[PDB]
């Protein structure tokens, strides 16, 4: 009986460690003997340790996660795809947590419960990746969302943080209800919720004249929920406001971790499933709308966080183009784009968190940064040129596949939209380089140097960005491996 739980050793460990950290934090934060010490950094270090130990347990026991698969079948399904997705998610959580210690210390955010909620949302995303049924998928999504709603309002005395929390809660509950309606429609039409049963019932018919309208609308409503989750237009307007209003570590965590978990969910619910190109048209049109709106709105922005939010919207559009084309290379390029965007976003948010010690708010605040910190200005410029897609930087892969799929799938309007949006994006990205290098403002802002954690992470991500294309084979091979694990 005990050995059946080898399939869930990582989750058992991380949940138990989170419980331990909760008890430790509550017991010693209320202690008069120790003068009620802030424990955000202590619990943060212990939780980074817990995340790393979970990653070791998951990575080392690669075959053991598939043990007792018949017994666990009606709860989840673990395979190669979920294995690598979960490893990536844990690494992203670890990097995000490592970027939080200066924020805890200098801002004096003393709440250790922030770390505990991040850990619980990580457990939720772990369960999302391995979900293989609509019920499990919904429950894990909801655990994740509730943790995010709480942490987005963590600065409970701030107008911005409370506003972001309120908008987040209302719109997220709305979208979750829509998705649950879709699940109910599918269940009523097919009498099934397991992904295998859904795969069998739907395969071979798609829209054959006598089309189950219940299955169609279930797919539609579930897709609307997923598109809300990935910040895709027109279900996107929550994301810029929430990203801006939340505390910057919260924004950093939301811009990376939840995308990996929900794209895993999207690939396992639909690609593994079967319906007409209708859903592919849904993601195609949403990708086009996302690129256009993201580009223009980012061009309009004067603040750094809002610009990064709209940039992320544009890039999810670029990524969803790979889902729409419905090929093995489409899934491979989607995974590659998600990986590269995650690394680039962590680079950018390490820079933003480093500059937030001096309260960077506007793009104009970066004036004369090439003088006051030359190495930092170059690192941010490498990231911005990677964002713009200029070769030989790592960001060029997304542009390359966007145009490759279009000229193959036969699309030319898509190629035109990609060209125009790429040029607009290049403009509003190089505006930041112009501000740091070309302008000569009357008043300068001198920024406090960053801590060791952010500098190490920045150095590693900058080396990856400048040099990934010299030796890119492991990423290509591992993404190809994952793409095939979905079908065979």
């Amino acid at each position: 009986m005990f050995n059946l739980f080898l399939a869930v050793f990582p989750e058992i460990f991380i949940i138990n460690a989170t419980f331990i950290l909760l008890i430790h934090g509550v017991v010693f934060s209320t202690s008069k003997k120790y003068d009620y010490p802030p424990l955000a950094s202590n619990v943060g270090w212990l939780g980074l340790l817990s995340v790393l130990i979970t990653l070791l347990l998951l990575a080392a026991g690669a075959p053991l996660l598939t043990i007792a698969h018949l017994f666990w079948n009606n709860l989840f399904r673990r395979d190669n795809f979920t294995y690598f997705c979960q490893i990536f998610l844990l690494l992203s959580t670890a990097g995000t947590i490592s970027m939080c210690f200066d924020f805890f210390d200098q801002e004096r955010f003393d709440a250790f419960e922030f770390i505990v909620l991040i850990l619980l949302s990580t457990c939720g995303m772990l369960f999302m990746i391995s979900a293989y049924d609509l019920i499990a998928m919904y429950l894990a999504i909801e655990l994740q969302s509730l943790c995010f709603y709480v942490i987005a309002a963590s600065k409970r005395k701030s107008e911005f943080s409370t506003e972001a929390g309120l908008k987040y809660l209302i719109l997220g509950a709305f979208s979750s209800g829509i998705l649950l309606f879709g699940c109910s429609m599918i269940y009523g039409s097919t009498g099934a919720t397991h992904f295998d049963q859904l795969a069998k019932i739907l395969t071979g018919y798609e829209i054959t004249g006598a089309r189950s309208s219940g299955i169609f609308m279930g797919i539609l409503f579930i897709a609307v929920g997923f598109l809300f989750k990935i910040t895709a237009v027109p279900f996107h307007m929550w994301a810029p406001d929430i990203y801006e209003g939340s505390p910057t570590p919260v924004t950093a965590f939301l811009s990376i971790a939840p995308k990996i978990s929900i794209f895993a969910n999207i690939l396992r619910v639909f690609i593994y499933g079967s319906y007409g190109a209708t859903l592919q048209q849904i993601f195609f049109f949403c990708s086009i709308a996302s690129m256009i709106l993201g580009a223009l709105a980012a061009m309009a922005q004067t603040k750094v966080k809002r610009l990064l939010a709209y940039s992320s919207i544009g890039h999810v559009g670029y990524i969803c183009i790979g889902f729409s084309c419905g090929t093995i290379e489409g899934i491979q390029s989607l995974l590659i784009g998600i990986f590269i965007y995650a690394l680039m976003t962590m680079d950018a948010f390490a820079i933003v968190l480093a500059l937030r010690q001096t309260r960077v708010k506007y793009i104009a605040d970066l004036g004369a940064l090439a003088k006051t910190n030359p190495i930092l200005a170059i690192t941010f410029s490498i990231t911005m040129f990677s964002y713009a897609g200029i070769p030989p930087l790592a960001g060029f892969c997304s542009k390359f596949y966007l145009f490759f799929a279009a000229l193959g799938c036969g699309a030319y309007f898509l190629a035109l939209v990609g060209v125009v949006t790429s040029v607009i994006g290049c403009f509003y990205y190089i505006r930041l380089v112009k501000r740091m290098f070309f302008d000569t403002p009357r008043t300068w802002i001198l920024y406090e140097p960053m801590d060791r954690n952010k500098s190490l992470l920045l150095a590693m991500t900058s080396f990856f960005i400048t040099l990934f294309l010299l030796y890119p084979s492991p990423l290509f091979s591992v993404t190809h491996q994952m793409a095939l694990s979905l079908y065979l």
Binding site: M1, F2, N3, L4, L6, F9, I12, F13, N16, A17, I20, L21, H24, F28, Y34, D35, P37, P38, L39, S41, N42, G44, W45, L46, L49, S50, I53, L56, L57, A60, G61, P63, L64, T66, I67, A68, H69, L70, F71, D79
Partner: protein
């Protein structure tokens, strides 16, 4: 409760025991298993101590880190031992004590 240990991907090494008991897996711990366990417990205690100095609770923080490390280290060692006994990991040592005994 009907149980079934059958894994999706078959073992690539001789199966010494397909469902080893808890006590048997623990008794199968090798010196490498005790090395992994001790390293994880020591690193965790060290991180607890170093992260606990600023709040002033280095002792209790050491205890909490050590508990996390003991749990994770036992889990990792049990994983390795059970996987060796089930043939999922290279287990030439377990096969020696099976052919001989």
């Amino acid at each position: 409760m009907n149980t079934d240990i059958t894994a999706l991907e078959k073992a690539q090494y001789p199966v010494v025991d397909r469902n080893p008991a808890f006590t048997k897996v623990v008794g199968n711990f090798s010196t490498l298993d005790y090395l992994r366990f001790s390293t994880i417990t020591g690193i965790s205690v060290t991180v607890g101590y170093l992260s606990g100095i600023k709040p002033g609770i280095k002792g209790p923080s050491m205890v909490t880190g050590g508990l996390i490390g003991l749990m994770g280290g036992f889990m990792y060692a049990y994983q390795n031992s059970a996987g060796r006994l089930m043939g999922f990991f290279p287990n030439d040592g377990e096969v020696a004590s099976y052919q001989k005994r």
